Amino acid sequence: SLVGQHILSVQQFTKDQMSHLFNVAHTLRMMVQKERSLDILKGKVMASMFYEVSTRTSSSFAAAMARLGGAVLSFSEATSSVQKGESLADSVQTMSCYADVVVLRHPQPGAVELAAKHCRRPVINAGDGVGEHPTQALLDIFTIREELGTVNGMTITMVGDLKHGRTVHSLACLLTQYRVSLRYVAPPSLRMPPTVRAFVASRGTKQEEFESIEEALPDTDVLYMTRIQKERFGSTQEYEACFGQFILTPHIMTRAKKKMVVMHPMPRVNEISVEVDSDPRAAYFRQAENGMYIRMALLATVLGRF
Amino acid sequence: SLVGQHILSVQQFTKDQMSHLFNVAHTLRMMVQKERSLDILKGKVMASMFYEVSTRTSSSFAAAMARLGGAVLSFSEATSSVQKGESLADSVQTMSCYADVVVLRHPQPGAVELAAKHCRRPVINAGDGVGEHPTQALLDIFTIREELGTVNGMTITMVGDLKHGRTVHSLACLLTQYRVSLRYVAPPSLRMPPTVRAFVASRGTKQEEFESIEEALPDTDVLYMTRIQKERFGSTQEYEACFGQFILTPHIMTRAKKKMVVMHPMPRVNEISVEVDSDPRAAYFRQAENGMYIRMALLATVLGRF
Amino acid sequence: HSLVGQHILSVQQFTKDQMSHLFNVAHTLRMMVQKERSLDILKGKVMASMFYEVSTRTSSSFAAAMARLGGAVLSFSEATSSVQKGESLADSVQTMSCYADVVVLRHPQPGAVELAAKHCRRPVINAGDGVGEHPTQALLDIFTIREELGTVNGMTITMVGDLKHGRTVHSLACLLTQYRVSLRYVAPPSLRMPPTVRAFVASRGTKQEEFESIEEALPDTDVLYMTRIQKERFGSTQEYEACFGQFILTPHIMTRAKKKMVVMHPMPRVNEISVEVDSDPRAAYFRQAENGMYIRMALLATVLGRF
Numbered sequence: 001s002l003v004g005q006h007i008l009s010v011q012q013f014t015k016d017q018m019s020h021l022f023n024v025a026h027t028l029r030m031m032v033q034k035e036r037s038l039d040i041l042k043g044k045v046m047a048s049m050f051y052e053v054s055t056r057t058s059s060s061f062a063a064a065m066a067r068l069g070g071a072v073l074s075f076s077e078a079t080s081s082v083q084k085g086e087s088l089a090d091s092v093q094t095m096s097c098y099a100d101v102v103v104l105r106h107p108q109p110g111a112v113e114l115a116a117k118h119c120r121r122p123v124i125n126a127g128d129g130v131g132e133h134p135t136q137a138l139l140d141i142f143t144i145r146e147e148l149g150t151v152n153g154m155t156i157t158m159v160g161d162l163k164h165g166r167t168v169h170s171l172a173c174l175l176t177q178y179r180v181s182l183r184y185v186a187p188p189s190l191r192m193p194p195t196v197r198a199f200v201a202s203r204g205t206k207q208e209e210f211e212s213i214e215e216a217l218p219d220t221d222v223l224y225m226t227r228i229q230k231e232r233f234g235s236t237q238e239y240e241a242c243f244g245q246f247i248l249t250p251h252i253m254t255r256a257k258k259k260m261v262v263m264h265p266m267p268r269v270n271e272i273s274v275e276v277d278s279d280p281r282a283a284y285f286r287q288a289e290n291g292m293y294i295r296m297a298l299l300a301t302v303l304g305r306f
Numbered sequence: 307s308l309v310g311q312h313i314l315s316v317q318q319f320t321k322d323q324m325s326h327l328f329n330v331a332h333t334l335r336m337m338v339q340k341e342r343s344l345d346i347l348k349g350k351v352m353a354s355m356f357y358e359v360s361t362r363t364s365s366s367f368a369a370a371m372a373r374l375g376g377a378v379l380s381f382s383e384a385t386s387s388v389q390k391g392e393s394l395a396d397s398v399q400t401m402s403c404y405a406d407v408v409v410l411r412h413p414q415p416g417a418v419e420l421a422a423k424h425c426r427r428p429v430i431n432a433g434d435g436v437g438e439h440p441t442q443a444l445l446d447i448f449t450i451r452e453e454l455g456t457v458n459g460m461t462i463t464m465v466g467d468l469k470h471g472r473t474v475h476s477l478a479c480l481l482t483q484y485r486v487s488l489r490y491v492a493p494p495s496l497r498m499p500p501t502v503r504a505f506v507a508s509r510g511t512k513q514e515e516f517e518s519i520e521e522a523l524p525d526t527d528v529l530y531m532t533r534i535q536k537e538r539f540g541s542t543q544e545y546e547a548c549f550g551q552f553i554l555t556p557h558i559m560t561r562a563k564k565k566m567v568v569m570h571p572m573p574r575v576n577e578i579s580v581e582v583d584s585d586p587r588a589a590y591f592r593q594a595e596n597g598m599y600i601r602m603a604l605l606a607t608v609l610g611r612f
Numbered sequence: 613h614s615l616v617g618q619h620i621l622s623v624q625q626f627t628k629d630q631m632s633h634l635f636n637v638a639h640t641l642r643m644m645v646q647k648e649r650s651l652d653i654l655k656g657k658v659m660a661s662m663f664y665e666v667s668t669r670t671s672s673s674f675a676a677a678m679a680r681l682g683g684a685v686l687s688f689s690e691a692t693s694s695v696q697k698g699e700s701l702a703d704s705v706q707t708m709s710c711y712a713d714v715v716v717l718r719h720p721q722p723g724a725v726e727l728a729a730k731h732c733r734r735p736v737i738n739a740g741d742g743v744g745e746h747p748t749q750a751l752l753d754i755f756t757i758r759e760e761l762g763t764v765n766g767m768t769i770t771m772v773g774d775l776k777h778g779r780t781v782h783s784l785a786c787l788l789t790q791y792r793v794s795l796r797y798v799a800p801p802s803l804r805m806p807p808t809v810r811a812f813v814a815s816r817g818t819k820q821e822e823f824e825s826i827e828e829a830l831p832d833t834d835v836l837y838m839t840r841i842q843k844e845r846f847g848s849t850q851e852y853e854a855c856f857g858q859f860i861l862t863p864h865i866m867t868r869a870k871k872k873m874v875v876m877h878p879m880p881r882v883n884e885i886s887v888e889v890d891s892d893p894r895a896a897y898f899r900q901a902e903n904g905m906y907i908r909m910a911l912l913a914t915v916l917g918r919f
């Protein structure tokens with residue numbers, strides 16, 4: 001039961017917990033459609049703390065807490081007393097004095113788990129540098145299930161920057177709970193990390209690397225595209241060399257399975273042609289909307305109403 | 307007839323639409339003044355996306371949502387994934403997955419309508435560069451009609467930067483829905499733009515230019531003062547010639563009519579002196595307050611609860 | 613008695629019965645909050661949060677307070693507002709009070725808050741004016757002192773660090789004179805307690821003594837009130853790094869402290885209280901912060917005519 005627990009890492013997620021949570025997510029989405037009265041989190045305040053920029057992850061948590069009848073406390077680093085020199089631990093300790101939950105994204109990996117040590121209320125990891133994005137894995141798995149019917153028996157193809165990409169890290173790890181085959185399409189420099197490729201191996205999930213998107217596609221049921229993480233590179237030179245390696249265009253999606261989904265945790269810069277947007281296999285915006293409902297489910301369960 | 311519609315341009319309003327909207331706004335303002343329950347928009351969510359700075363337009367939409375029982379997602383460029391390089395089009399379609407209505411201010415003219423072209427939720431233009439500001443002009447006509455009892459049969463003198471002023475572009479072109487006269491008092495390099503002038507001329511309203519506040523004033527019912535837009539200038543030299551030229555003072559006012567109002571979208575820098583504000587004809591603080599109630603009407607009707 | 617509609621700018625305007633009532637109402641709301649009693653006492657009502665200097669506790673605990681009463685909150689920061697377009701302070705404040713029923717304002721120029729409230733139609737609450745006052749941090753400081761030790765009377769409080777720049781130590785020292793207290797002061801000569809304050813504290817008849825170090829000041833301390841060396845106000849960095857870190861509280865110093873005693877800090881801290889002190893029961897600085905939410909719920913409720 002997720003009640004009152006730190007949500008730090010995909011590891012802790014039982015298959016039973018995820019399915020409880022997919023179910024509550026489908027319930028909460030029904031009531032929003034039915035224009036039902038949601039006073040579920042009336043009284044409860046969420047502390048949204050972002051030290052690293054966000055659009056979907058911050059907006060999805062905020063919209064969710066609103067739509068459960070809760071309130072949100074906005075916290076950015078730039079206008080906070082961080083600027084007086086406050087430590088990350090003290091910032092988190094203080095925001096819990098006001099809030100029932102803490103959503104923390106931060107640029108340094110393990111910072112969230114480090115701050116969550118002395119935190120006396122549930123802290124949700126919304127991204128820890130290149131480490132992990134746990135609720136994003138959860139919504140991607142929900143979306144796969146939603147778009148195709150099952151997750152078991154599926155071939156997931158992760159393309160792009162796997163080294164920095166905290167979403168694929170979490171997502172690869174978590175897809176070890178489903179009978180899947182993973183394929184990686186990266187340049188040598190941005191290959192999926194060792195601990196991750198080692199973790200996935202030890203669960204038995206068959207990993208495979210490919211050089212291009214042309215090769216992986218015809219067997220790919222789930223095509224997960226990523227963004228060349230420009231702000232994690234040691235030098236632009238390294239970045240601009242890698243920028244634009246893979247570019248999904250409608251020409252490429254003419255040898256993709258009829259049954260098939262293209263995802264992206266967003267934002268995209270170059271890596272998906274806008275023309276792809278019309279193909280109904282493109283579910284990356286539907287992926288966004290799912291996120292709000294899963295995060296509604298997590299906030300309801302972690303605060304212990306569903 | 308405004309339900310589920312983008313609010314992009316004043317040329318999309320008719321008279322019935324406006325009169326309905328003002329009527330809903332009086333109706334909502336009374337509800338607020340008696341202190342009744344207001345859950346007109348309970349559960350619902352507005353995306354507040356400002357790419358330029360704002361005080362009035364952002365606060366009024368948010369106070370408006372809040373008094374209707376709704377909730378607001380505050381979005382900023384700076385803390386957003388714009389920084390990762392996400393385009394305006396994605397940003398607007400992604401916020402719509404969380405929200406029922408999108409309020410967009412953008413520094414590029416035509417941006418908001420381009421962003422609204424293929425967005426599936428309603429988008430309210432809250433200012434698109436030197437283009438338009440439809441809801442300001444909607445609350446300006448409201449305030450005029452609130453402060454004098456009519457707009458029909460009146461003369462309006464627009465003073466300041468008319469070339470850059472999106473407020474006056476909207477207001478002038480909308481005023482031609484009434485029986486009115488227009489006076490223009492700017493330096494030669496900031497006259498009203500030509501396409502806007504030809505529209506007014508095409509609809510058959512009097513466009514008369516003038517030399518100064520002194521000259522237009524005697525016969526002016528609405529004195530609409532605007533700011534010199536520093537951010538809109540190429541060279542500071544070109545702004546510092548234009549800056550502090552037209553200045554309203556109590557002495558200049560003694561020549562005005564008793565049945566007259568001075569308006570200003572705000573903020574002012576120096577164009578109206580601080581002594582002017584104690585004259586009951588100073589109707590610019592009541593113009594902002596009216597904007598909140600117009601925005602309430604505007605939201606409830608666009609979201610189909612009035 | 614009674615702060616309905618009233619501006620909240622200085623602790624000079626507070627009586628004892630206004631504090632009592634406000635402390636009482638802070639307890640009433642806490643418990644209603646503890647019972648998940650579904651509160652909508654300020655449903656409809658809007659607060660404008662106007663911060664011209666950065667914040668964490670003050671902004672968040674005003675914003676949490678409102679939300680927990682059922683009200684709304686308009687966030688206002690200088691950087692992304694039309695302050696950028698030239699707008700002066702009065703205009704901004706006067707504009708936000710058109711939208712909102714109460715205005716909380718934090719500004720860097722001393723006195724700019726009272727001066728912006730002059731011509732304002734709604735209540736304006738001072739959440740900090742430069743190196744001047746911090747009236748609602750003074751109220752929550754005295755609440756925490758009362759809750760932590762059973763009473764404020766007969767206590768000696770010791771204030772430590774940057775007394776000169778300390779907007780919260782000016783309010784508190786001034787406010788405390790409405791009890792029977794003995795004040796001890798610890799600061800390097802360049803950061804002593806301003807002369808306006810400590811003659812003001814002279815007048816009301818409250819003893820004052822200027823101790824040389826924490827260790828000397830601890831034996832008889834019932835409230836050790838620590839403060840941050842205020843970097844953003846100094847000359848001159850050269851004057852800052854001379855002062856930065858000259859008083860630091862450790863678990864070793866504490867082993868001579870009274871048993872019935874508490875350790876307070878308005879926050880944040882940089883290094884003046886060892887993280888190693890946080891597990892110590894008497895370290896009340898986080899309980900002091902939660903307390904603030906409930907105090908500032910009682911402010912909003914009372915200033916808007918609820919209790």
Ligand SMILES: O=C(O)C[C@H](NC(=O)CP(=O)(O)O)C(=O)O
Nearest residue numbers: 054055056057058227265266387
């Ligand atoms: O940024 C990416 O490329 C992937 C991933 N994206 C997101 O979380 C979406 P957002 O940053 O808009 O909240 C991330 O790591 O932040």
Ligand SMILES: O=C(O)C[C@H](NC(=O)CP(=O)(O)O)C(=O)O
Nearest residue numbers: 360361362363473533571572694
């Ligand atoms: O900014 C001006 O001077 C005029 C006008 N002003 C406003 O809308 C006021 P604000 O920027 O505070 O929303 C505009 O078109 O931006």
Ligand SMILES: O=C(O)C[C@H](NC(=O)CP(=O)(O)O)C(=O)O
Nearest residue numbers: 081667668669670779840878879
């Ligand atoms: O910052 C201090 O040292 C004391 C005092 N602190 C506060 O008010 C807390 P905050 O800045 O997080 O609102 C201040 O003067 O700002």
